[PDB]
Write a protein that binds this ligand. Sequence first.
Ligand code: A1BKP
Length: 167
Amino acid sequence: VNSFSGYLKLTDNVYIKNADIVEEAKKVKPTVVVNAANVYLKHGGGVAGALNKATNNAMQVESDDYIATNGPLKVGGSCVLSGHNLAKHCLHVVGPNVNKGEDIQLLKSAYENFNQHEVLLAPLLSAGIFGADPIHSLRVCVDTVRTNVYLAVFDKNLYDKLVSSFL
Ligand SMILES: CC[C@@H](Nc1ncnc2[nH]c3cc(F)ccc3c12)c1nccs1
């Protein structure tokens, strides 16, 4: 039993809700919140900009030190950093950005990072400003993640479309 509330169950391990991931993280304080990161950990907009703003820019400060030490992530890769006031940990995961021409096949590799964590609060990878089809992202999530994932979808209209079209 966990503290996530109001989710629709899609499969044995995947759950979904129309919610603002920032507000959801502040309420649940999950062990792991997933950020929709880029390779530079520049949290300017989308989910990343919102999560970073909620940390009063502490996420960005920590991220800049991480990059200065380690260099950029790979597309499809991840790193574990602090969750600040939102979660114990933040798993920064880089899905391919279609608006940069990146290979959508890397979306499966991106979701594989979730399997290293027993329970996660997450957005749909490569959705929103990353330009992929969210219906496809949900399909890849369900077919790749085996651990327990609670998906927050900000847009109510999109949430209803994801549920109604789910196979
Ligand atoms: C992963 C893509 C998804 N983004 C989000 N998902 C869950 N929670 C979110 N909170 C936010 C707060 C913000 F300021 C900006 C963006 C988001 C956001 C979207 N898919 C379609 C349209 S936006």
